[PDB]
């Protein structure tokens, strides 16, 4: 255990969706709302997780685990570097439908370690 350290850095980091170019749009260091109005349902978040996680969960409307639930998925895992080969995360992608969230915002939350859930901050979109 030394590079599988736990989750210590969440971050939305950048978005797009399918109806806009697939322009991830680098969100600024503490940004709170969208680049641009989204066009599209396909919500692709690239999140910066620097630190180990398998437990991410998005509450949605509903209030239970989307990537659960039936649309979410990550489906696309690449790998960070921190210079020195230092696994410092893996940028963990995912496909969420804008329909099913509770407001016309995203945000992500993810098990740090024992209790600790990291909650991302908000980026409120607009919807076309």
Do not use: C, H
């Amino acid at each position: 255990g030394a590079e599988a350290l736990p989750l210590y850095y969440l971050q939305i980091t950048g978005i797009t969706s399918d109806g806009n170019d697939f322009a991830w749009d680098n969100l600024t260091s503490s940004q709170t709302k969208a680049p641009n109005v989204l066009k599209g349902n396909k919500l692709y978040v690239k999140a910066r997780f620097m630190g180990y996680t398998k437990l991410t969960v998005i509450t949605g409307k509903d209030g239970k685990n989307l990537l659960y639930n039936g649309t979410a998925k990550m489906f696309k895992s690449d790998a960070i570097l921190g210079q020195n080969k230092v696994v410092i995360g893996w940028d963990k992608y995912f496909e969420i439908p804008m329909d099913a969230l509770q407001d016309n915002s995203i945000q992500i939350k993810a098990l740090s370690s024992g209790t600790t859930f990291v909650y991302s901050q908000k980026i409120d979109f607009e919807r076309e």
